[PDB]
């Protein structure tokens, strides 16, 4: 993006929730272009968040996400030869991107054999406040701010 400012492509609303944030997560769950396979995993997991919880998946989803959105992170920079981790805020678009990605990544790191389960189980632990997705998040934040001595390098 040396020229213009790149336009964030708009996604197709969910066919089961008319939600774009879902399709987004579904795409991240997606492997080698096989979307059908992906979609299933999600819904199948939504049905599992249905049984094991009176709350509707869509709601568990949102919350799970919301908790894993980092609000601060440390990006590098060169000064005097040494490298400094400059703590800077995190734009909305990126917060989301890191969230959904982190979930799926944390999910597939889980011990349960069935995919749809891991996505369901990670999603739950998420909204709950626990889970490695959130651990990754809290860590990015610990990292950031924990360098407040270099914050005077406003990006």
């Amino acid at each position: 993006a040396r020229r213009r400012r790149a336009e964030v492509r708009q996604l197709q609303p969910d066919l089961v929730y008319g939600d774009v944030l879902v399709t987004a997560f579904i795409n991240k769950i997606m492997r080698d272009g096989k979307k059908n396979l992906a979609a299933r995993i999600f819904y199948d997991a939504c049905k599992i968040i249905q049984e094991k919880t009176g709350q509707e998946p869509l709601k568990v989803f949102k919350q799970a996400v919301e908790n894993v959105k980092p609000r601060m992170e440390v990006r590098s920079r060169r000064v005097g030869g040494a490298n400094y981790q400059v703590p800077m805020e995190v734009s909305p678009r990126r917060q989301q991107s890191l969230a959904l990605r982190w979930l799926v990544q944390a999910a597939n790191q889980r011990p349960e054999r069935r995919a749809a389960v891991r996505i369901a189980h990670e999603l739950m632990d998420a909204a709950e406040g626990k889970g490695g997705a959130v651990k990754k998040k809290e860590d990015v934040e610990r990292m950031a701010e924990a360098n407040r001595a270099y914050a005077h390098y406003r990006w």
Partner: protein, 119 residues
Amino acid sequence: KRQVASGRAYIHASYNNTIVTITDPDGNPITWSSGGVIGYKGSRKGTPYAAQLAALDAAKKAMAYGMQSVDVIVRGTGAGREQAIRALQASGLQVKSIVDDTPVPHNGCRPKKKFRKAS
């Protein structure tokens, strides 16, 4: 312990550190801090954040004597002078007035090479 209520706050900014000395209404020091007194051990001492803490530390230490207001005296130029001030204005302590009093010779001693080639 002695109770003072009002006093002086001398911020001494440098490019290597920022020390702070809180004194009674007529110069005698009550408490003090610096980038060293607090954690930072090195070049970190000069950073503005360091300045902020040193300010707060000294500020806090001071209130443990009653100090409620202070007159500020700034000396020197440094990557962390304004922050020390801002820190004291927020340290609960009342900042009666800020005043620079950085020493400057009316041209006298020959500076080290590190500062010449000037003019």
